[PDB]
């Protein structure tokens, strides 16, 4: 009927633990959890069947609530490879299987000696357009129109087909940290 | 255990398309879903046993057959008004909802074959300031202006593909994200040691495989037909 998943998005450092949730308006006979990579098929992680059931599969721990309307998925020591969309699915005696919208998890690889910096690179063929590269920033960094273009691991790139496009503009009001190396 | 083919599908509106799903797990039940960015997975059709099918919530404009245990073909007809989506097939045991999914197929449908454009591809050379700061050198590849968003990017150095140091965007991004009618871009980074970049005998190539028009598609325009094709750009080592 209604399957809700929380949080919708989660960005975390490698090494962090996390818990995500599946909440239902109605009782389920069973509930399944899946992980999906972009443009790939969801992979089944678990089925839970009994109210109160806890299943530990290695770094992943699942619980089905006593009332069979809620489920948690917990990851211990998250790894870059855990990145993906975690899907919840179930049915309950109406027997209409229903899919949640998912939690999109992004795990940022460790960076033990950060060196946040913004660089400007030139085109090989030198039409002399450039891109801006923001790199070597830690996990507590989060990355004015559809023209200025951006791509968010530990690096982000920005580009634009305007001439007043400066790298200082593309990466600021944003979240470059305090000691970012920013060469001319 | 489950095959969908092909990975990418491009069609003009009004043209029926049949998506294949074949299964060797000896499962009775088979399923079709569509996946849209704001929705997760929605059931199109469910077939619990050979010859049995039940419509999902969005079967409007879709058709399926199930004459064999091992195959579940999906036809997308002209009556589906929003057919662009990622389509996933799955199978399960008869008395279960524990599913095993195929790899999925990206279908894109367009008003006009003239709306297809292959990527332009450019490689941006490592910053000398990065090199002196970190002793590392990041190359950036940009593929831009393409439609449909059906591309695969790879990096090749001295003619051999590499994976170490590569970080590619998981999916193409709309250049006009706030709007329906948009072309796509994709970026990728290759990071190597400065010493490796500074060797002029090292040749770095960004290669983008585009999936576009097929040779049974007709084309009358002056510009080169936007067929499935590879587009590449290079930057060579610089001993600065």
Q: Does A121 touch chain B (CB under 8 A)?
A: yes
B220: distance to nearest CA of chain A, Å? 30
* Structure tokens that stand for B158 in this block: 């001295």
Question: Parallel, antiparallel, or unpaired: how do β-strands A43-48 and A149-151 relate?
Answer: unpaired
* Coil/strand/helix, residue A156: strand
Q: How far apart are CA A167 and CA B93, in angstroms?
A: 55
Method for structure elucidation:
X-ray
User: Which residues, other chains included, contact B62 with Cβ-Cβ below 8 Å and sequence gap of 6+?
Assistant: B32, B44, B45, B74, B75, B76, B77, B80
Which among A39, A100, A153 has CB closest to B104? A39
CB contact (8 A) between residue B134 and residue A41: no
CATH (domain of B61) = 2.60.40.10
Q: What domains lie within chain A, and their CATH numbers?
A: 1-109 (2.60.40.10), 110-184 (2.60.40.10)
CB contact (8 A) between residue A90 and residue B97: yes
* Cβ neighbours of A2 in B, within 8 Å: none
* Coil/strand/helix, residue A80: helix
> Do B156 and B224 fall into the same domain?
yes
Contacts A–B by Cβ distance under 8 A: 124
Q: How far apart are CA B65 and CA B74, in angstroms?
A: 7
Domain boundary among B90, B111, B132: B111
Which among A99, A127, A146 has CB closest to B177? A146
Contact between B167 and B153 under an 8 Å Cβ cutoff? The reply is: no
Strand partners, B5: B20
Domain boundary among B111, B130, B160: B111
* Structure tokens that stand for B239 in this block: 């001993």
Which among A122, A135, A151 has CB closest to B173? A151
What residue in A sits closest to B235 (Cα-Cα)? A124
- What is the DSSP code string of B78-145? TT-S---EEEEEEEE-TT----EE---EEEEEES-GGG-BPPEEEEEEPPHHHHHHHSEEEEEEEEEE
What residue in B sits closest to A46 (Cα-Cα)? B98
* Coil/strand/helix, residue A169: helix
Residue-number span of the structural domain to which B57 is assigned:
1-111
* Structure tokens that stand for A37 in this block: 């990579």
Q: Which residue has the tokens 């990975």?
A: B7
Domain boundary among B61, B88, B111: B111
Residue B88 phi, psi (nearest 5): -120, 130
CB contact (8 A) between residue A146 and residue B176: yes
């Amino acid at each position: 009927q209604l399957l809700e998943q929380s949080p919708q998005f989660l960005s975390i450092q490698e090494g962090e633990n996390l818990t995500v949730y599946c909440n239902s308006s109605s009782v389920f006979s069973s509930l399944q959890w899946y992980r999906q990579e972009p443009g790939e098929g969801p992979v089944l992680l678990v089925t839970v069947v009994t109210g109160g059931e806890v299943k530990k599969l290695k770094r992943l721990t699942f619980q089905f609530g006593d009332a069979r309307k809620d489920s948690s998925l917990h990851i211990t020591a998250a790894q870059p490879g855990d990145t993906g969309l975690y899907l919840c699915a179930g049915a309950g005696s109406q027997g209409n299987l229903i899919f949640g919208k998912g939690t999109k998890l992004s795990v940022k690889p460790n960076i033990q000696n950060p060196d946040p910096a913004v660089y400007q690179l030139r085109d090989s063929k030198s039409s002399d357009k450039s891109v801006c590269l923001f790199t070597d920033f830690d996990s507590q960094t989060n990355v004015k129109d559809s023209d200025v273009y951006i791509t968010d691991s530990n690096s982000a790139v920005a580009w634009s087909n305007k001439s007043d496009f400066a790298c200082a503009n593309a990466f600021n009001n944003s979240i470059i940290p305090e000691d970012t190396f920013f060469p001319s | 255990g489950i095959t969908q083919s092909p990975k990418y599908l491009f069609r003009k509106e009004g043209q029926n398309v049949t998506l294949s799903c074949e299964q060797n797990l000896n499962h009775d039940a088979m399923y079709w879903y569509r996946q849209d960015p704001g929705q997760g997975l929605r059931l199109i059709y469910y077939s619990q046993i050979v010859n049995d099918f039940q419509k999902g919530d969005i079967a409007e404009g879709y058709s399926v057959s199930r004459e064999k245990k091992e195959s579940f073909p999906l036809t997308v007809t002209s009556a589906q008004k929003n057919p662009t989506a990622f389509y996933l097939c799955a199978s399960s045991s008869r008395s279960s909802y524990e599913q095993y999914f195929g790899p999925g197929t990206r279908l894109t449908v367009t008003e006009d074959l003239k709306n297809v454009f292959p990527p332009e591809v450019a490689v941006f050379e490592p910053s000398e300031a990065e090199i002196s700061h970190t002793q590392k050198a990041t190359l950036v590849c940009l593929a831009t202006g393409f439609y449909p968003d059906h591309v695969e990017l790879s990096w090749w150095v001295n003619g051999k593909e590499v994976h170490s140091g590569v970080s590619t965007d998981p999916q193409p991004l709309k250049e006009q994200p706030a709007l329906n009618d948009s072309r796509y871009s994709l970026s990728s980074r290759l990071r190597v040691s400065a010493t490796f970049w500074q060797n002029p005998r090292n040749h770095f190539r960004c290669q983008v495989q585009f999936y576009g028009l097929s040779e049974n598609d007709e084309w009358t325009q002056d510009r080169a037909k936007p067929v499935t094709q590879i587009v590449s750009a290079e930057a060579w080592g610089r001993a600065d």
